[PDB]
Ligand binder design. Structure first.
Ligand SMILES: CCCCCCCCCC(=O)O
Ligand SMILES: CCCCCCCCCC(=O)O
Lengths: 259, 258
């Protein structure tokens, strides 16, 4: 008996709703509702990175979407990598509107491994990697302002197991990420046991992820245990690109289990 | 095998992203390819309201063309509306272009004006299905932008493409400013000695819209190119519906017009 669900997808750094296109097609084709959002200055969001130095504005598209969700409608919230921070805040604020939260290789901070610990670790795996670079729109006296993903970094660390056209698509769409201050993130993403902790949570491991190392991911899983950990073999960092059908099937299974 | 440089220019609502399959095939086969975002398209930083003049829309292509040392020739490909953009590039920098390719592109010339092909092109989009216009300049002024609707895209543009490409497009299409005919006519002026000196190939690719094909035949008849090629089974976005076939056709054209 077909039970219509509402999947809400949240991209990682530099990306946008566009990266989910294969997943969105499978969802809409099977009759489910799906909303792929562009966070601040991501995808075709009108804001420019330099215009939104506050993490609050990076996350606003999701928070605003969450706030206007209809009465009693519950969603399957999916966050990829950095998107993990966004859905975490959504979990703390609107825990009742989320049937189950899914972290796809996502930054998954919790009361005992906070957002800043997690962001500091994440930053080390992206800043300075291959051809990635930063800008100083506020002068040499201030912290770098934005991070720009390089094509070689994308091909090697992110899309190494995906169709080459997807790499081409990414290089024509990735945008800069404002380097939000740890202090700002810490005040925005604060999680509690009775709110964030009350939302069903599943973590999906990308077996061949060369962007976010195993040790970091298992540190988060260890210190902020999810209700379940699932795995997708042969997937690079962007599972929605390299292993779309498997991610789709897994998502449907997760939605049915926790509905 | 001689390395070539293809420069791809999209149509309304789109961006460099729509050529992803083509870009991929060109890079792996060893060629250079530049897929540009015109004003307020793809990830270009401008918003439609910020580029009310057609020259603002063409800016990314003209800047690109100007940055090219004259010895570095290119194969300039324009899709549909992108035809107007490459036509302008042809008039301004004729010598930097080995061959211009109009993929079902608006191909105005001396005997068929730019405003003429524009007005006709628009009738097929304005007021179609779920497409809609905005009025940022108030109710008593002409509409300011045109927004492509998902249904319009599904049945009129991507009807022969993988369904995921339709989804991709719905997450990326952006508004097109409704440029004035006066503006466009003044902006796209072509002469036989300049625009006319560039080798030109038109690629007909449309399948179940006979009127659309007539329009394409009209422009070909009024402004005859050096050659006309066809691609079967294509919807409005050939780079999506017939990628391998488009790639092959472009390689073939490039090798012929060196
Ligand atoms: C200080 C903020 C920078 C954090 C970088 C987050 C990296 C997420 C990983 C990814 O690229 O998908
Ligand atoms: C800017 C003139 C307003 C009319 C709409 C533009 C024509 C779009 C047609 C097409 O896809 O080729």
């Amino acid at each position: 008996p077909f039970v219509k669900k509402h999947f809400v997808l949240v991209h990682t750094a530099f990306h946008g709703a566009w990266c989910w296109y294969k997943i969105v097609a499978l969802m809409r084709s099977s009759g489910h509702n799906v909303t792929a959002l562009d966070l601040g200055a991501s995808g075709i969001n009108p804001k420019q990175a330099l215009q939104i130095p506050n993490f609050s504005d990076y996350l606003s598209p999701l928070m605003e979407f969450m706030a206007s969700l209809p009465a009693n409608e519950k969603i399957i919230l999916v966050g990829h990598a950095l998107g993990g921070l966004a859905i975490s805040k959504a979990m703390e604020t609107f825990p009742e509107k989320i049937s189950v939260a899914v972290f796809l290789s996502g930054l998954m901070p919790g009361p005992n491994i906070d957002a800043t610990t997690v962001c500091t670790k994440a930053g080390s795996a992206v800043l300075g990697q291959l051809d990635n670079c930063v800008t100083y729109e506020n002068g040499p006296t201030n912290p770098p302002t934005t991070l720009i993903a390089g094509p070689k970094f994308l091909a090697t660390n992110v899309y190494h197991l995906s169709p080459i056209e997807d790499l081409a698509l990414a290089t024509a769409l990735v945008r800069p990420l404002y380097l939000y201050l740890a202090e700002d993130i810490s005040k925005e993403v604060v999680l509690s046991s009775k709110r964030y902790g009350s939302v069903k949570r599943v973590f999906i491991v990308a077996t061949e992820n060369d962007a976010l190392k195993k040790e970091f991911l298992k540190l988060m899983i260890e210190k902020n245990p999810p209700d379940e950990v699932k795995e997708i073999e042969g997937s690079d960092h962007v599972t929605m690109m390299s292993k779309p059908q498997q991610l789709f099937t897994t998502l449907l299974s997760i939605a049915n289990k926790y509905k």
